[PDB]
Short mmCIF file of C-alpha atoms in Angstrom, two decimals:
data_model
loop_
_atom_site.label_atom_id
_atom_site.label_comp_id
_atom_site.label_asym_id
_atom_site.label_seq_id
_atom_site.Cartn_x
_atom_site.Cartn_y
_atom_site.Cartn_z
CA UNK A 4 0.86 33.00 -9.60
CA UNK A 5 -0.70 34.06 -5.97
CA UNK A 6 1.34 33.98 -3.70
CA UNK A 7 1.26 34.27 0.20
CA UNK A 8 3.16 32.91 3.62
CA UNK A 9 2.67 29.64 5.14
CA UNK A 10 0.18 29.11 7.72
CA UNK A 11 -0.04 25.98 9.61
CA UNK A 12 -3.79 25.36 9.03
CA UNK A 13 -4.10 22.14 11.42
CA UNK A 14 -1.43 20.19 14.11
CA UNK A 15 -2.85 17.72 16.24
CA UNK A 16 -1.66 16.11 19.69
CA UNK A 17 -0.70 12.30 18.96
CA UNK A 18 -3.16 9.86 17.93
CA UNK A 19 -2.92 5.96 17.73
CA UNK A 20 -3.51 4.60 14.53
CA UNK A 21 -3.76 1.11 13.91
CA UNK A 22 -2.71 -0.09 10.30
CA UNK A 23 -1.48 -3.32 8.37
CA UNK A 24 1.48 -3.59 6.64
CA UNK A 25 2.86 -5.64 3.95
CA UNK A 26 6.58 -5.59 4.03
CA UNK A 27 8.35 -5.63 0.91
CA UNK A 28 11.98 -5.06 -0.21
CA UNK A 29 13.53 -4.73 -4.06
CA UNK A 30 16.90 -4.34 -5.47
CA UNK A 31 17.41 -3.28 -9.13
CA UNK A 32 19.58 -1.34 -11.30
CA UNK A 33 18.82 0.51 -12.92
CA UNK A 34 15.74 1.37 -9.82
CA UNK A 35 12.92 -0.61 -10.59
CA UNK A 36 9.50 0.64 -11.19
CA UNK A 37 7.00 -1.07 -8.27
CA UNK A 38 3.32 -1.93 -9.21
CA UNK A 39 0.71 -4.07 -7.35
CA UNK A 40 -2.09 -6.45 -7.91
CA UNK A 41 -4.76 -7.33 -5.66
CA UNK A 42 -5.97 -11.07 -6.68
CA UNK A 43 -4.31 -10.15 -10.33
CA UNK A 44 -6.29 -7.28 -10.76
CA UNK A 45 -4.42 -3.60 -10.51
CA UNK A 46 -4.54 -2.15 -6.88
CA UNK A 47 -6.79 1.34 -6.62
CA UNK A 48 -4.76 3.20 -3.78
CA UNK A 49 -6.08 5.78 -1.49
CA UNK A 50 -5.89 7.20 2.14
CA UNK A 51 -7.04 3.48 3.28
CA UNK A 52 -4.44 1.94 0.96
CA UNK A 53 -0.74 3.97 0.78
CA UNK A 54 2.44 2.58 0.05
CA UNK A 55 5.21 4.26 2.14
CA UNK A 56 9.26 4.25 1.83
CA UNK A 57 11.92 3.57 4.37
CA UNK A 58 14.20 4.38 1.18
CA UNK A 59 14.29 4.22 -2.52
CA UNK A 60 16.71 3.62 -5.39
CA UNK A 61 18.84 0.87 -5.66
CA UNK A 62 17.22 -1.06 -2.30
CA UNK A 63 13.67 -0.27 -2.20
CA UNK A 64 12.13 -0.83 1.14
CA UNK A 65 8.78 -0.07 2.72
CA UNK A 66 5.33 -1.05 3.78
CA UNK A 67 2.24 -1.54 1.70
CA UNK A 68 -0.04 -0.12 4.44
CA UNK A 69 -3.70 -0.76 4.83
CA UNK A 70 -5.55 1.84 7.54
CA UNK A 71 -9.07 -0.11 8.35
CA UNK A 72 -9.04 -2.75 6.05
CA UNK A 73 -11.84 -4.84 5.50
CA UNK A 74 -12.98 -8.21 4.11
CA UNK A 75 -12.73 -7.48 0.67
CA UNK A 76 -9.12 -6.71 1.02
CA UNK A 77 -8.35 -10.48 1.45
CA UNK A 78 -6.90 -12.01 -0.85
CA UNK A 79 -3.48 -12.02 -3.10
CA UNK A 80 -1.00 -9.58 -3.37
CA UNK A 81 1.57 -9.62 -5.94
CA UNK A 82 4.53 -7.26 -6.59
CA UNK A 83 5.84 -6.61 -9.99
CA UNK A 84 8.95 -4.51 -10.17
CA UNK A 85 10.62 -3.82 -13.81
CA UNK A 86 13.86 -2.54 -15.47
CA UNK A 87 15.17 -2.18 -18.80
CA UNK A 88 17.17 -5.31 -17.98
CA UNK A 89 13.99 -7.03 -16.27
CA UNK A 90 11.04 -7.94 -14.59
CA UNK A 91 10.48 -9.49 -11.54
CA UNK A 92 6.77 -10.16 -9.56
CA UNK A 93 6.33 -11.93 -6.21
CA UNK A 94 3.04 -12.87 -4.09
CA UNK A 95 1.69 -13.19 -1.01
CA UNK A 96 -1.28 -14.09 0.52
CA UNK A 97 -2.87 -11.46 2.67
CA UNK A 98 -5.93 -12.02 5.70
CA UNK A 99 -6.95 -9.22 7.34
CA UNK A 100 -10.39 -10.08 8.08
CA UNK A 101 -12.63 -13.12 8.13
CA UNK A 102 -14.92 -13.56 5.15
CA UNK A 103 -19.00 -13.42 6.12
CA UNK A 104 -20.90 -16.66 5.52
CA UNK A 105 -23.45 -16.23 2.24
CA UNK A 106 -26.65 -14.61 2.43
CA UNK A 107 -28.31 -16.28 -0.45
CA UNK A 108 -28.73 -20.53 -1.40
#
């Protein structure tokens, strides 16, 4: 392959950042596998939506972290963690923002 040395391409001075988290912690043995639904239908992640770990393995803990959510990111949230022994799937009810009136009759 091509190699070369590291170069630090980009470090910025501190910046606030505002974002909304969704707490969440598992337990399972062996670790359970973590998936979400937003209003039963499978979560798309991204840079706006990124789940991020406090630790993993046995205790899973974190935040399910939305950065500039907006209306259409109301709704449920439900948490289905599995292992060969089980399944297990939790919800919650998440507002970030409020929902426009309609537009049409």
């Amino acid at each position: 392959t091509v190699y070369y040395p590291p170069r630090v391409v980009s470090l910025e001075e501190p910046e606030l950042r505002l974002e909304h988290c969704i707490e969440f912690v598992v337990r399972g043995n062996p670790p359970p596998t973590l998936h979400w639904l937003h209003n039963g239908q499978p979560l798309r992640e991204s840079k706006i939506i990124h789940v991020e770990y406090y630790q993993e393995g046995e205790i899973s803990e974190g935040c399910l972290l939305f950065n500039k959510p907006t209306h259409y990111n109301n709704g449920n949230y439900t948490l289905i963690a599995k292992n060969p022994l089980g399944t297990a799937n939790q919800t919650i009810n998440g507002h970030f923002l409020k929902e426009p009136f309609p537009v049409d009759e």
